[PDB]
Symmetry: C3
Subunit: 137 residues, 3 copies
Amino acid sequence: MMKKIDVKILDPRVGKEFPLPTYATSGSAGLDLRACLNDAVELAPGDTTLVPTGLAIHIADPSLAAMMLPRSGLGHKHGIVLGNLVGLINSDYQGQLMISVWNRGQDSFTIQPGERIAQMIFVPVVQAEFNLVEDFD
Amino acid sequence: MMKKIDVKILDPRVGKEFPLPTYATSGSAGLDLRACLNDAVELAPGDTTLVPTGLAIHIADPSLAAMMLPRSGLGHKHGIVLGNLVGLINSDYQGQLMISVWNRGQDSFTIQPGERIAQMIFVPVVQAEFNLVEDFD
Amino acid sequence: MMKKIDVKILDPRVGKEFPLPTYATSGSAGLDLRACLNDAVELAPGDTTLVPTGLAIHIADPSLAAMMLPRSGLGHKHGIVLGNLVGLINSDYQGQLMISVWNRGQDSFTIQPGERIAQMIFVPVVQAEFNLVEDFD
Ligand SMILES: O=c1ccn([C@H]2C[C@H](O)[C@@H](COP(=O)(O)OP(=O)(O)OP(=O)(O)O)O2)c(=O)[nH]1
Ligand SMILES: O=c1ccn([C@H]2C[C@H](O)[C@@H](COP(=O)(O)OP(=O)(O)OP(=O)(O)O)O2)c(=O)[nH]1
Ligand SMILES: O=c1ccn([C@H]2C[C@H](O)[C@@H](COP(=O)(O)OP(=O)(O)OP(=O)(O)O)O2)c(=O)[nH]1
Ligand SMILES: [Mg+2]
Ligand SMILES: [Mg+2]
Ligand SMILES: [Mg+2]
């Protein structure tokens, strides 16, 4: 299923020096997000840094959310994952998309400007209404 | 999409001193879960603690699951995430919802009673049946 | 919702000595994945190891992805989680399914051959097309 998502470019290098997020292939679940940075950021073991994307999206449909995830290679091989583990993006969020980058491993890592440092999937979400009961079936 | 989910209150403070989980806004993907605790729990760096919710849900529809996730602020800023990383709640689970709270950072943290310590999304899930093949297309 | 997923057995012990992944119950969201190993692997605190499944799947439908997650018991109780935190499996991926096993805790752990070391859910995914705007609504 396809959905057009409104995006506001906040940094003029996004779409230019830092390409807009893209699906690496046509069967790819996730779009790879790029670090919108002026200079490289050295992330020491155990440390977390907030990386700008230079963009804002507005999902708008409350039946939809996005989830930011590590990329497998960075996570597995380099211990470069998310400080919030999974980043949940609400349909009504219109701020800048930010990446909490966490070095969960033993080796210092250089986050380069423009690096595809995380990915994001769009998934349907269901809004629950609680029905109080004394017992289940 | 909307779904009524049966909930059993297990601790009588849930719905009273500890509010039932709620969507912070109407476009929010996740419901914030509250720590059903008698007293605050001090979580040292690197440590994990099992936090009760004082509630049980029964999703019941095998086309639906819930996923518990860190909240971004706690995860990023405080290193307060999940010890199981993501908590998957099965449609047929009827036990108490529990939160594995893990301090992945360097600073000791006080989990207060009633704190919105994690969030939960409901997502559709697909049940796979494997089709054995010698080769793909 | 149900979906047949093509699977290629890559190791002849899969489906024999190492059972194919299964839903523990009929309301279970996830299939438990087994470590296709010749011998046990001792995973020291803080270390990551790549575990084969001995199988390959081909989801094929770009409206579907899988997500690999820790199992709650291993994650919470033993600190045995995923080095990539969540493993996203793309619809067009046809390689061997691999598990990045990460010991996030303080105790050494033996990964036995055949152990149900992680689980996998199939979720619908939406492919986004960006619509550039100057302002949101
Ligand atoms: O990796 C992330 C995670 C979240 N967000 C944004 C989008 C999301 O809608 C908002 C709030 O996320 P969450 O609800 O997980 O964090 P919170 O701590 O509950 O903040 P709030 O009180 O605003 O809901 O932060 C990001 O930009 N990056
Ligand atoms: O953060 C969590 C994660 C899970 N659960 C409950 C709901 C879920 O349905 C059950 C089992 O979860 P999972 O299948 O991930 O753990 P397991 O180690 O495989 O236990 P089991 O053998 O019972 O399936 O534990 C929670 O209360 N909190
Ligand atoms: O735990 C995992 C995660 C991923 N994969 C496979 C399936 C997935 O389709 C592929 C690529 O995953 P991802 O896109 O997260 O990693 P990447 O670093 O971006 O590699 P690539 O550049 O190939 O997309 O790796 C696994 O076998 N196990
Ligand atoms: Mg990728
Ligand atoms: Mg929130
Ligand atoms: Mg299980």
